[PDB]
Design a protein around this nucleic acid. Structure first.
Ligand SMILES: [K+]
Ligand SMILES: [K+]
Ligand SMILES: [K+]
Ligand SMILES: [K+]
Ligand SMILES: [K+]
Ligand SMILES: [K+]
Lengths: 263, 264
RNA sequence: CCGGAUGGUGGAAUCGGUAGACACAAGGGAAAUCCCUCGGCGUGCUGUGCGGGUUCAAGUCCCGCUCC
């Protein structure tokens, strides 16, 4: 018998060279497979809903695999976790049909960017938040961002190493708010082009610091040029908070956080 | 030569340090902090913290002071020192204070926050900054079973052996337990605390929360004046020295105590 | 006149904080993905035209020299 299982993985990529399995470096996927394999007692290969670059964290990542071995729930949750490193962890298990597929079944991914806005660098979670010196204007930022909403040509916020096809994406919602000293950027789209978020954030920050007009983000978008927008934003601050899947699969959706961040 | 009494608001992540207490043998927050301060003042510097934390415990409201004959502009102590500090340690603010100031002795009351990730499966993000407690906690029940420690009591049951205070008596300003999504936070403020006082109150408070003991237990323990009766000391990675109290005359800056996104 | 002269190329570095972010190449190993290297030395040092200086700290300031 083949069993298609879906796991909700969570992690802290600060100590990993990303998710993708590199035969020469540390990858969340690798550590995750080693464990799953020990439980199923057979070589296991997983498929994630969205690979994160080296540095980016995850709290809503979703993966699936097929094992011939039958393990009770705890085996996949409490079990795998017992084999996983402290930074990586399983949030929930759920057997799914054959028509499910972490990546291809995903209707839209969602990210959150954590910006610690203070003159002096942070200490706690120094690898989990991006530190931005210049005073940000959450208000102004949010406004200068609604122009990216909908379907547009994110070429200006694209990448040259983008292995995807058409640079067109559909943004469900992009909001920027401030939590005390923090500034958070929540963005949801059907998908994103290489470094799309870290780029939108980069240019959004310049605006926030009043180094550019609100109209700049819009001018960039239509500029269809990358060498016009700000430089890619730091990684340590990006969190893959949540992925969208058809309600028919009935996958559990726990708080996306990160941490104390309201859902 | 002029002597300058300076007060720094230090913040850090003790996950990688054997505590604050400078030890000529291991990594201590205080040591790394002094090395830096010294490079700035270009003279051996010795600091005094408002409350030493044990190996593991973090800090976001810690306050220290020192005296240097060297005159450095503000940035030198803030942006400067930080530039010499490790990434986990950091200065939050500088402030020259009078001679009658003293981080420890001037402190009117310290304050802590305990972060409990209440979920069957262990956390990944901040795995060293939050305490993972398997059994389902009852924030409500916990808070209630705690108000009995409020005020001045004999915290012998929540004390320790390696304790140096000549008296295990303390005055609790307030102890509250709330739940943030999967988290359970315990905020406690007192004039001072006896060795492992907080981690102990939390330990026994958790047993109650998990319904392994009655709300009346915390109270029975307190009056029991016995330690071998209460729960075992709670984990360290979850304790944060969020804030210290000082006379308003000193006018020290009081930024958000957090940790992180935690409302002030 | 004043503002610049930093990597192979752009292009950064909080009204002195401890280089080269970021982007785009190149080269090598495991059409493209990916690791590491890509100032000079080598057997970590000195290096932000060039020596000298001040400062705990200099690309970041004071002085003499070359060119926009
Ligand atoms: K630094
Ligand atoms: K430098
Ligand atoms: K530098
Ligand atoms: K010098
Ligand atoms: K120079
Ligand atoms: K000069």
């Amino acid at each position: 018998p083949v069993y298609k299982i879906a796991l909700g993985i969570e992690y802290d990529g600060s100590k990993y060279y990303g998710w993708q399995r590199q035969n020469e470096v540390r990858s969340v996927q690798e550590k995750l497979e080693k464990a799953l394999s020990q439980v199923a007692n057979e070589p296991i290969t997983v498929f994630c809903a969205g690979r994160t670059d080296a540095g980016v964290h995850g709290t809503g990542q979703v993966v699936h695999f097929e094992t011939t071995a039958l393990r009770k729930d705890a085996a996949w949750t409490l079990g795998v976790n017992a084999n996983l490193p402290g930074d990586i962890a399983v949030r929930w298990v759920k057997t799914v049909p054959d028509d499910f597929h972490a990546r291809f079944s995903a209707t839209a991914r969602r990210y959150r960017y954590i910006i610690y806005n203070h003159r002096l660098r942070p200490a706690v979670l120094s690898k989990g938040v991006t530190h931005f010196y210049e005073p940000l204007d959450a208000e102004r930022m949010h406004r200068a961002a609604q122009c990216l909403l909908g379907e547009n040509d994110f070429t200006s916020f694209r990448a040259v190493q983008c292995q995807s096809r058409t640079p067109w994406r559909n943004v469900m919602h992009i909001n920027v708010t401030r939590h005390g000293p923090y500034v958070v950027v929540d963005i949801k789209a059907n998908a994103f082009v290489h470094h799309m978020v870290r780029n939108i954030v980069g240019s959004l920050m310049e605006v926030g610091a009043h180094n550019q007009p609100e109209s700049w983000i819009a001018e960039l978008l239509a500029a269809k040029d990358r060498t016009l927008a700000a430089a890619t934003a730091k990684a340590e601050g990006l969190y893959l908070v949540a992925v969208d899947y058809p309600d028919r699969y009935d996958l559990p959706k726990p708080p996306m956080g990160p941490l104390f961040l309201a859902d």
